[PDB]
Amino acid sequence: KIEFSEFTVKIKNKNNWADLGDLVVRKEEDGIETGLNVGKAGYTATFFSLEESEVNNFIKAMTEGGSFKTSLYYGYKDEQSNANGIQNKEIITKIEKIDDFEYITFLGDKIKDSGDKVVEYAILLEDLKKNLK
C-alpha cells in the first residue's frame, strides 16, 4: 500500500552539476506522474509517467538504485524527446556521492543535435527516501 499523494523535490542536471528546478511527483489512479517546474512559473510540463505495474520498481530504484519502465518520457528542453515524447523508456538509477551527499542519479534522453551525448539528472537520496512510502 502506497501512502504518498504528491511531493516536490529539487532536481539537478549536468552543465558540472547545476540546479535545474523542482520535480513534482504525484500518485495517480494508475501509476505515477512526474512534472518539471523550471524558473519563475517559467517552464511547467510532464517529465515522465509510469503505469501501476512499475510503481514498486520506481520506489526501489528511487530509494536504493535500480531500474523502471516509463510509459512516456519527455525530459527537459535540451532532449530530443521533449517535443514528441518517447514511449517505454527504461530509467536506470545509481546512488552517487556529490560533495559528501548521496544522490539518486539517472540518464535522460539524447541531446537534440549531439552525437549520442545524454543528459544526466540528480535528486537528493534523503528527499526521496522520506517521501516514497
Author numbering: 38 to 52, 56 to 80, 87 to 179
Can I see the authors' text?
The bacterium utilizes a set of proteins, termed complement regulator-acquiring surface proteins (CRASPs), to aid evasion of the human complement system by recruiting and presenting complement regulator factor H on its surface in a manner that mimics host cells.
Several of the loops between β-strands could not be built in one or both copies of ErpC in the unit cell owing to a lack of electron density, suggesting that these regions are conformationally labile. The observed molecular mass of 17 000 Da correlated with the expected molecular mass of ErpC (18 316 Da), confirming that the protein is monomeric under these conditions and, in conjunction with the PISA analysis, that it is likely to be monomeric on the spirochete surface. Mapping the sequence conservation between ErpC, its paralogue OspE and members of the OspE/F-related protein family, including ErpP and ErpA, across different B. burgdorferi strains reveals that variation occurs mainly within these loops.
